[PDB]
Design a protein around this ligand. Structure first.
Ligand code: FAD
Ligand code: FAD
Ligand code: 2LD
Ligand code: 2LD
Lengths: 340, 340
């Protein structure tokens, strides 16, 4: 039973591992392999700060709220294991800031100590007039990928660096199941008109005195297009760029001044920060995630494909739920294939 | 009008600058001079995390409750500006942990977002059943002391490196007023039996993933004598050592182990951390701060003395209220002298 996962960002690597650990003892030849064009230094996953927080509004597929709540609990049960550092996992508090009051978000009892800004906290932000403060989790993508990687390897899940043209090339070559974890690029292997790039751009800066996340929200510039400051483990992420449809994987001088001006307004101490790096990535945007089966009518008998992509600005937030569900699906195949 | 300040600690410099800023325009020759035995790399002040937090009970002298309060409004009103990193100021949230319930602190409203630990929070803490969370300030001692220095130097105040054997030597040599900011060493100039050193030992460690302060209290063992973890700007401080009357300015093997054990236990990820540095100091302990006047008879006329010492473990949390207060007292000497 040879299983091929396509793609090595968080969605693939997490799905590969969650699938291994749940079914390695109940399948004898269970061969897992990861094919991916770009690996762990070079993915959208690596560009993400890793803060956990779903959209303000409720999911088109209400299941998603579970997947988020799930990923959170799991990471939270692990915040104090003594790996977390390796992981890139840690607790962080910070501010959400709005121009006008807004309902409480749905996840408010998932996060630790949710609550509203007191006018004192607000005064430090001339431009914003209401907001939240709550304690959450960051899982830095770069480390997490490095981590998932070492877990997978000792499990002898094998990695190949290679761009795949179709599902049939892979089905032709051996595989009974394909886990489709291709993110923004998913369309190139099965036209999906619903899935667009949300180009995003970020500045990594050296400002270690910054201990809180600060996120600004504005319906006029719209989701993720508004200044945010996110302390990482070695570095602070400075962002707020979102552009539907943009395919330029290039750092753009305009966008740089925008990040830079928006965050200075927000935190003037950032004047003396040293820029370290700058990076661009594509949000796999979609009205909702595609996480579902398809029997692909390849050759004599068709092969099974699990889809898992279109995770948008919240992949790190939801990956774990998503992987449990990818695996459940996978277990559903097994029984139907009379092999459990 | 010739002023000697003894002590280049936080109290000395802060007061020195408060006095100058408040009176160089009203007094014609204002000669302010700082005399110090040890300077700004080598004082107790340089050992302090710098986290604003008064005792959890009410101050003997409840004027202290205001001095602490004013200090925090003033620091907060300077937290956003291109200065703050120079001063070493910044905001930080975190946890107070107790075994049993305790009444709220009297400062509860001074800080931002003071609140009780919800049970999900307290689960991250096996060893503890109760606590608070809130957002306070760090003013790291070393930076603060460098900032005061260049602020003083540029205001013309002169520094001298020297040990002063008696008030009278300095009156003798020509001071109209002496400002006694000599900390735990005060009594070497005027016997104060109530003044005692609480010895303290801390570890500076590398764990930048740490974004909250975490303070534990056990009354079986005292204040400052139970593990605390305070992240700084460049480094995280591990302490929990308080010892009345010890005068050994030497790092100690057992204290080291106690710090490292209690801290590793509070936060397991601390195990893979790099030990950077270690330091000892003497909180200048005393039932209350001594902050008053006394005219020292000393030949033809008496020199005026302002004492400002015995700040124990809340030196930074309080310095500014105190300095405002020494200037108040200074102002009074002036007017009485028919010089206001
Ligand atoms: C600037 C920015 C900030 C973000 N911040 C956050 C955040 O703070 N929190 C959060 O929860 N999320 C955040 N995100 C969202 C997160 O980055 C994405 O959701 C996530 O990386 C998508 O995961 P993925 O595995 O689907 O994508 P990717 O990491 O991009 O994985 C796609 C993988 O598939 C490979 N691949 C694709 N097609 C093929 C093919 N045909 N053949 C071979 N290999 C192929 C690629 O090489 C890559 O390995 C952020 C995103 C951006 C852009
Ligand atoms: C381990 C530890 C942690 C602490 N953490 C905190 C914290 O997190 N937050 C907080 O608010 N406070 C904290 N404190 C408290 C704070 O460090 C002290 O209250 C404060 O630094 C004392 O200020 P000072 O100027 O009175 O003393 P010092 O900084 O010791 O200054 C005394 C100065 O007077 C000089 N001097 C004395 N006698 C003479 C003389 N005869 N002639 C010349 N010079 C003389 C010395 O050379 C020195 O320059 C901590 C203390 C310790 C020990
Ligand atoms: O694409 C992104 N996803 C996620 C984040 C984290 C910060 C954030 C911003 C606004 C709402 C919720 C989270 C940043 C991104 O740039
Ligand atoms: O001497 C000290 N002063 C101050 C602190 C700050 C942490 C703390 C711990 C318990 C109560 C209040 C503050 C640490 C010291 O060791």
């Amino acid at each position: 039973m040879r299983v091929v996962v396509i793609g090595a960002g968080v969605i693939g690597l997490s799905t590969a591992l969650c699938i291994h650990e749940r079914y390695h003892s109940v399948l004898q030849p269970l061969d897992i392999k990861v094919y991916a064009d770009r690996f762990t230094p070079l993915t959208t996953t690596d560009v993400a700060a890793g803060l956990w927080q779903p959209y303000l509004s409720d999911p088109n597929n209400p299941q998603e709220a579970d997947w988020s709540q799930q990923t959170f609990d799991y990471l939270l049960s692990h915040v104090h294991s003594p790996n977390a550092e390796n992981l890139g996992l840690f607790l962080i508090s910070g501010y959400n800031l709005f121009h006008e009051a807004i309902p409480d978000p749905s996840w408010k009892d998932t996060v630790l100590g949710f609550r509203k800004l007191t006018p004192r906290e607000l005064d430090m932000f001339p431009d914003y007039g209401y907001g939240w403060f709550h304690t959450s989790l960051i899982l830095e993508g770069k480390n997490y990928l490095q981590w998932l990687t070492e877990r997978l390897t000792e499990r002898g899940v094998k990695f190949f660096q290679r761009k795949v043209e179709s599902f049939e090339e892979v089905a032709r070559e051996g595989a009974d199941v394909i886990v489709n974890c291709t993110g923004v690029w998913a369309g190139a292997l099965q036209r999906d008109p619903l899935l667009q790039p949300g180009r995003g751009q970020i500045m990594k800066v050296d400002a270690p005195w910054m201990k809180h996340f600060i996120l600004t929200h504005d319906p006029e510039r719209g989701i993720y297009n508004s200044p945010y400051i996110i302390p990482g483990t070695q570095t602070v992420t400075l962002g707020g760029i979102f552009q539907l449809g943009n395919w330029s994987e290039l750092n753009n001088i305009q966008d740089h001044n925008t990040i830079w001006e928006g965050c200075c307004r927000l935190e003037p101490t950032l004047k003396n920060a040293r820029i370290i790096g700058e990076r661009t990535g594509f949000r796999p945007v979609r009205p909702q995630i595609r996480l579902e089966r398809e029997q692909l009518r390849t050759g004599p008998s068709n092969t099974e494909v699990i889809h898992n992509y279109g995770h948008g600005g919240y992949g790190l937030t939801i990956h774990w739920g998503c992987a449990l569900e990818a695996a459940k699906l996978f277990g559903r195949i097994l029984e139907e294939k009379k092999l459990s």
